[PDB]
Design a protein around this ligand. Structure first.
Ligand SMILES: CC(C)(C)[C@@H]1CC(=O)N(CCOc2ccc(F)c(C#N)c2)C1
Ligand SMILES: [Cl-]
Ligand SMILES: [Cl-]
Length: 371
């Protein structure tokens, strides 16, 4: 089971695609909900994402049907298409997923943020870094739900530098576009969702605190955070979950005015990646780093919850730390960070100690030596 949000709000979830093209926005929305009697949200909602993950794990295509059998009926604890809790303006998080992942696989994070009063827009990237994603070739195709699927691109050694940078820049554009879309919807611009779902987007009208916007993401999405911040000042701070720094150009490091928080796993990081994180530092600017003790790279994503302890540790989905304890630390620290830098009037400052790595399961800064 993926754990429920810890906050006071019930959580809802829906999907939005606009426009219908592979240049449009596709996102999974998590939001504070009015109602709590809806069905829970299907975690991986199409067979082709499993096919996609097979290609990502670089295994027999047949392994996609096994993954489907095991996981295809699993849900995450958010009410599907629940009405939005009215009468309050909610800060907005744009969330960027990792390589081989897609929009649905960071629900633990999305759900918990929503339960504390954020609308979270988990984007699905069309840079071919997602295991799979889909779109519609034309309007008729969208109408009848005739999906066209786009799978992960596998790179040769010598394309790596160039394409990863191309991808991370496409990712930032997609975060910006997704922001512009939600803001248009906040202002009441009628949007026809290309997905034909029973969730009225006009509920979101005047529901976004338009100044209080952040970007968060895992690994390739951690790099996306940084590129996005440098390109788009509407985002007011960012949180990088175990960022993979490779895709970023050398130019960006000195070009991040907004507060930025690195939350790392213990076992993923390495000197080359940390050195790059340290290039983002400047004493005029606001930077924090913590390391979650006993954690692995996958502790930030939902699959850390999909299997048992033993098999989870076997597949490097789980670390020595308990996955719930781990994600609580990451989520609570993030919330403290968000309250400070978006200027929120909540109680998330109770976890200010977490930002500084003051916990038995936290390391301030990093365990990685780079001198
Ligand atoms: C550091 C790299 C190995 C080069 C990549 C860069 C990157 O982005 N990585 C993280 C992916 O995370 C996922 C993927 C698929 C999932 F299904 C899930 C889940 N759940 C997480 C790892
Ligand atoms: Cl790891
Ligand atoms: Cl290294």
């Amino acid at each position: 089971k993926i754990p429920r949000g810890n906050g006071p709000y019930s959580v809802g979830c829906t999907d939005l695609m606009f426009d219908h093209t592979n240049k449009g926005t596709f996102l999974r929305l998590y939001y504070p909900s009015q109602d709590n009697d809806r069905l829970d949200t299907l975690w991986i909602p199409n067979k082709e994402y499993f096919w996609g993950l097979s290609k990502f794990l670089g295994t027999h295509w047949l392994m996609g049907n096994i993954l489907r059998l095991l996981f295809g009926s699993m849900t995450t604890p958010a009410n599907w298409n629940s009405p939005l809790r009215p009468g309050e303006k909610y800060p907005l998080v744009v969330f960027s997923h990792g390589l081989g992942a897609f929009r649905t696989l960071y629900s633990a994070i999305g759900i918990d943020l929503a339960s504390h009063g954020f609308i979270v827009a988990a984007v699905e990237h069309r840079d071919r870094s997602a295991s799979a994603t889909y779109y519609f070739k034309d309007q008729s195709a969208a109408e009848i739900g005739d999906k066209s699927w786009l799978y992960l691109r596998t790179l040769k050694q010598e394309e790596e530098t160039h394409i990863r940078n191309e991808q991370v820049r496409q990712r930032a554009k997609e975060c910006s576009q997704a922001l512009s879309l939600i803001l248009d919807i906040d202002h009441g611009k009628p949007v026809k969702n290309a997905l034909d779902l029973k969730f009225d987007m006009e509920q979101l009208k005047d529901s976004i605190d338009r100044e209080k916007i952040a970007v968060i993401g895992h690994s390739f999405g951690g790099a996306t955070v940084i590129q996005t911040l440098s390109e788009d000042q509407r985002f007011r701070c960012g949180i990088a979950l175990d960022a993979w720094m490779f895709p970023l150009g050398d130019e960006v490091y000195s070009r991040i005015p907004q507060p930025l928080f690195f939350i790392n796993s213990e076992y993923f990081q390495y000197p080359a990646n940390i050195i790059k994180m340290k290039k983002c530092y400047s004493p005029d600017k606001e930077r924090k780093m913590i390391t979650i003790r006993g954690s692995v790279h996958q502790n930030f994503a939902d699959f850390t919850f999909a299997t048992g302890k033993i098999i989870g540790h076997m597949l490097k989905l789980k670390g020595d730390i308990d996955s719930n304890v781990a994600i609580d630390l990451s989520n609570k620290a993030s919330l403290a960070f968000l309250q400070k830098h978006l200027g929120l009037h909540k109680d998330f400052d109770q976890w200010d100690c977490l930002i500084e790595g003051d916990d038995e399961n936290l390391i301030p800064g990093t365990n990685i030596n780079t001198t």
